[PDB]
Amino acid sequence: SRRRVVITGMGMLSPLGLDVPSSWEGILAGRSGIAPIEHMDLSAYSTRFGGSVKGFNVEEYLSAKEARKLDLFIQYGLAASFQAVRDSGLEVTDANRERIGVSMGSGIGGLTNIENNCRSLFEQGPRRISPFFVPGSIINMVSGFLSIHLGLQGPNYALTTAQTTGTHSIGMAARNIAYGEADVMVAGGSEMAACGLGLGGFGAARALSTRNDEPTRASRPWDRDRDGFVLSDGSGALVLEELEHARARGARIYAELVGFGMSGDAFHMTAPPEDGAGAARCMKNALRDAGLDPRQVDYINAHGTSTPAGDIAEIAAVKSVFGEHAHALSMSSTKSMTGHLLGAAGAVEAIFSVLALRDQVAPPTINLDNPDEGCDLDLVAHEAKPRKIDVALSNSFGFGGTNGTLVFRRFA
Amino acid sequence: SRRRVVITGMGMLSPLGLDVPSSWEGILAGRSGIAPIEHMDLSAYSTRFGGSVKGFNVEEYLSAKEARKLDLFIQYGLAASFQAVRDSGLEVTDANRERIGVSMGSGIGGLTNIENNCRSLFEQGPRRISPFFVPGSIINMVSGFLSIHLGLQGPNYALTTAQTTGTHSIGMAARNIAYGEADVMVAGGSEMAACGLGLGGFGAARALSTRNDEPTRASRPWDRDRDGFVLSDGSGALVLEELEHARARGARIYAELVGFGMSGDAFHMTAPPEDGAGAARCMKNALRDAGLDPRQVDYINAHGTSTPAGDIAEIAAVKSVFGEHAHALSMSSTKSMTGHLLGAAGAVEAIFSVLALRDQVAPPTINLDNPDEGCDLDLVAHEAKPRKIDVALSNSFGFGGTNGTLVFRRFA
Numbered sequence: 001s002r003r004r005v006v007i008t009g010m011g012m013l014s015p016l017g018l019d020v021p022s023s024w025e026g027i028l029a030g031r032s033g034i035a036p037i038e039h040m041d042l043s044a045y046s047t048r049f050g051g052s053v054k055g056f057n058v059e060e061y062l063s064a065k066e067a068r069k070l071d072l073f074i075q076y077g078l079a080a081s082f083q084a085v086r087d088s089g090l091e092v093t094d095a096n097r098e099r100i101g102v103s104m105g106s107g108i109g110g111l112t113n114i115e116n117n118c119r120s121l122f123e124q125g126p127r128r129i130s131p132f133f134v135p136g137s138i139i140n141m142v143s144g145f146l147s148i149h150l151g152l153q154g155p156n157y158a159l160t161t162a163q164t165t166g167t168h169s170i171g172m173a174a175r176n177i178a179y180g181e182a183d184v185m186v187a188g189g190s191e192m193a194a195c196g197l198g199l200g201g202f203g204a205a206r207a208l209s210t211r212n213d214e215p216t217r218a219s220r221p222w223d224r225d226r227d228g229f230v231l232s233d234g235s236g237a238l239v240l241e242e243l244e245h246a247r248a249r250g251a252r253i254y255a256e257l258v259g260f261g262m263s264g265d266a267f268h269m270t271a272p273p274e275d276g277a278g279a280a281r282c283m284k285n286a287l288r289d290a291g292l293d294p295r296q297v298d299y300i301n302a303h304g305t306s307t308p309a310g311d312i313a314e315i316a317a318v319k320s321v322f323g324e325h326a327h328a329l330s331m332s333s334t335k336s337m338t339g340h341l342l343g344a345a346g347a348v349e350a351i352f353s354v355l356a357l358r359d360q361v362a363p364p365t366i367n368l369d370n371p372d373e374g375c376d377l378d379l380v381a382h383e384a385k386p387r388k389i390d391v392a393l394s395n396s397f398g399f400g401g402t403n404g405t406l407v408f409r410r411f412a
Numbered sequence: 413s414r415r416r417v418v419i420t421g422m423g424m425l426s427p428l429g430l431d432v433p434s435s436w437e438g439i440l441a442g443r444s445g446i447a448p449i450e451h452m453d454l455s456a457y458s459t460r461f462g463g464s465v466k467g468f469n470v471e472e473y474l475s476a477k478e479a480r481k482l483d484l485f486i487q488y489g490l491a492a493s494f495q496a497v498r499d500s501g502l503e504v505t506d507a508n509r510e511r512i513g514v515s516m517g518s519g520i521g522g523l524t525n526i527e528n529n530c531r532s533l534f535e536q537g538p539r540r541i542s543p544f545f546v547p548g549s550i551i552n553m554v555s556g557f558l559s560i561h562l563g564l565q566g567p568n569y570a571l572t573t574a575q576t577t578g579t580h581s582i583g584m585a586a587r588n589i590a591y592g593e594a595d596v597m598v599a600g601g602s603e604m605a606a607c608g609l610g611l612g613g614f615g616a617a618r619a620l621s622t623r624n625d626e627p628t629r630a631s632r633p634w635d636r637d638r639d640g641f642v643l644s645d646g647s648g649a650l651v652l653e654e655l656e657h658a659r660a661r662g663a664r665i666y667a668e669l670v671g672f673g674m675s676g677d678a679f680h681m682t683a684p685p686e687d688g689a690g691a692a693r694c695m696k697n698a699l700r701d702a703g704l705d706p707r708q709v710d711y712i713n714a715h716g717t718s719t720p721a722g723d724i725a726e727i728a729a730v731k732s733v734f735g736e737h738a739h740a741l742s743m744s745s746t747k748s749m750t751g752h753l754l755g756a757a758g759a760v761e762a763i764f765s766v767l768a769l770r771d772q773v774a775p776p777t778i779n780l781d782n783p784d785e786g787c788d789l790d791l792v793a794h795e796a797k798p799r800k801i802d803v804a805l806s807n808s809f810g811f812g813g814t815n816g817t818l819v820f821r822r823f824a
């Protein structure tokens with residue numbers, strides 16, 4: 001009894017732009033959105049750069065009063081969520097509002113808000129904690145606020161699976177629709193971790209590039225001189241719709257979401273298995289889910305974080321799943337341009353996977369100057385590659401050995 | 413091909429006990445776990461009491477070296493998870509590990525760790541932030557660390573739906589099993605929010621009881637003089653198992669999980685609608701999901717937080733859904749005794765709803781001295797009521813207007 005799920009709406013904030021067609025222009029032109037951070041003093045930090053959303057005006061979306069109650073990550077997820085709903089042309093009615101849900105997640109949630117309230121608490125005591133500190137900081141408040149704003153009475157939840165969050169949110173929402181629990185879902189992720197604790201936390205884990213002299217060159221997935229990931233901010237939301245609901249209202253359809261894989265590695269808290277066994281199981285489950293032979297995959301949007309162990313583990317995973325086909329598909333990391341939006345990474349990379357299908361073009365991996373040992377696949381170095389893409393795959397893995405794979409197909 | 417799902421294992425840390433049987437004895441005896449908070453100086457705070465886990469020894473489960481790097485919510489989540497898996501008698505093998513997953517959630521996760529690291533950041537500087545801060549504090553690391561310790565390679569994720577988290581984590585895991593994505597899932601939630609930001613934050617929102625003179629009488633759901641909820645910490649975990657998988661290995665089955673409802677209110681960020689329309693919609697979805705006549709419901713474990721608005725919304729929902737049968741069923745709030753474990757509230761209350769079925773007894777609502785206007789149902793005031801229970805329901809509501817209902821049935 002499994003219903004087909006298609007994408008009818010997309011919304012985005014990224015370091016490359018304030019919407020989807022600005023971010024995508026940047027992806028195809030191979031631009032970086034990485035720069036020295038301007039909103040705080042990082043003198044004592046070992047990393048001083050990352051991907052900020054530049055020029056965000058929350059009052060295009062909310063009243064000043066509404067915005068003052070919400071952490072930036074929630075502001076960001078609402079912006080991308082409202083763009084996606086507008087993009088879909090969906091009309092919410094008394095007849096359909098219990099068939100429309102939301103699954104917007106985040107990896108690290110209201111860390112920035114918690115920092116600012118912590119400063120007030122330490123400087124002047126608990127009477128200075130904002131009344132809205134709790135509702136304004138918790139990860140489900142993108143789902144909560146969106147559903148209250150639009151009157152959505154379908155499944156209302158949030159995933160938090162670290163750097164896998166966006167991929168899991170989109171996949172579980174697909175499941176909701178395929179198994180008849182909803183007809184429409186808004187899904188994706190938002191992240192704003194560019195605070196003392198985020199740069200300091202990930203930096204204490206020795207997980208960040210320290211290439212402070214050349215921020216636009218720091219993120220270089222599968223390059224021999226990679227030294228960790230680049231911390232970035234933003235959001236991605238997709239409108240997922242049962243196929244016949246989309247066709248019934250004359251919705252423009254971007255792609256079909258055919259396959260979803262999850263699988264734990266059970267390996268280590270913060271490092272992947274070098275052999276890519278985790279990504280491997282997950283991609284295979286996603287392909288089984290889609291009813292697709294590995295040889296039908298044309299494009300992979302890699303997780304490709306620019307860490308030493310992560311990048312090579314992903315090459316191994318792909319070689320295992322795809323055998324000889326590995327040298328026929330294209331794989332790239334848009335994190336080379338966007339940096340790592342953590343729990344939003346899978347959301348914005350789903351969108352880029354969908355636009356690779358719409359536009360028949362593999363986005364580049366910029367800064368891929370000297371591919372490392374074993375990195376001999378078509379990694380689309382430096383420049384966008386026009387090619388045939390009928391099937392795009394998007395991979396995410398996260399802390400705690402969490403893995404997510406989405407399979408999208410062109411459809412005409 | 414929707415498969416049936418049973419409970420084969422349960423685990424818990426609560427203000428009444430360091431396991432299920434100790435906690436349940438507390439519940440049936442009408443014992444309060446609420447006491448003045450010992451682990452900090454709260455003289456500047458308007459709320460100075462709550463439910464602590466008392467005498468918790470993480471070394472009954474994990475080495476000192478590991479435990480030291482984990483926030484209390486992760487220690488609580490792992491303890492409950494390990495209890496539930498031992499209680500199930502399940503053996504993890506190469507033949508099944510890919511069919512066993514985990515969904516242990518939290519409302520806000522690593523708040524104590526975040527506060528302590530903020531202190532380090534503001535007094536000392538970023539070089540004093542723990543390298544284990546991110547993996548030891550983020551919400552998906554109960555799922556992550558449990559997969560790593562036991563070798564679980566099934567679906568690995570975490571929900572964060574505020575005070576609804578433990579109910580949704582259980583329900584969605586059951587959906588995973590129902591649709592073939594897993595045969596076994598460890599599901600529930602864990603919370604430790606008893607720090608400056610938690611008491612200060614919920615206090616600033618004016619959500620907390622301020623009955624400092626009488627802590628054990630502060631939590632009084634449906635009582636006229638209720639003045640906000642009581643903040644508690646802990647964890648609940650269930651082993652969910654496909655029925656033929658349970659039968660095949662001859663497992664002890666506690667109950668069947670026959671229904672799961674979700675719904676957004678789409679009303680307000682921190683307040684329910686007075687009529688409880690979201691709770692009503694959620695319970696109706698759950699009962700329809702279970703294929704039951706509403707007159708089959710014998711026992712409701714209410715969300716019942718002791719907030720002025722929440723308690724009366726939930727009587728209105730129960731009147732709307734069950735009509736005259738609202739006067740035949742028993743409804744109680746175990747939060748009268750445990751207080752509010754937030755993201756874990758739905759986990760520990762699921763376990764109490766299953767034990768109500770095993771032991772044919774409705775837990776009491778303690779402190780119900782003066783039922784408020786319209787609170788004219790059997791709310792099991794003061795003392796446990798032995799009675800027939802074939803079907804038990806557990807309700808959860810959260811900030812963001814998130815709702816979830818679980819329906820359990822004696823297995824035969």
Ligand SMILES: C=C1C[C@@]23C=CC(=O)[C@@](C)(CCC(=O)Nc4c(O)ccc(C(=O)O)c4O)[C@@H]2C[C@@H]1CC3
Binds near residue numbers: 205207229271399
């Ligand atoms: C235990 C070790 C060894 C160490 C050495 C090599 C490395 O590459 C890093 C820096 C990062 C590993 C990794 O890719 N994790 C890792 C992962 O498993 C899953 C997701 C991500 C992500 O960024 O989304 C990620 O980053 C690790 C982390 C920590 C200290 C240095």
Ligand SMILES: C=C1C[C@@]23C=CC(=O)[C@@](C)(CCC(=O)Nc4c(O)ccc(C(=O)O)c4O)[C@@H]2C[C@@H]1CC3
Binds near residue numbers: 719
């Ligand atoms: C907007 C208002 C009005 C106000 C007036 C009387 C009240 O009863 C409270 C205190 C609590 C509302 C409520 O139960 N929320 C509420 C909710 O929707 C969902 C879950 C819970 C829970 O604890 O699990 C919860 O607590 C509200 C909260 C805030 C300030 C005072």
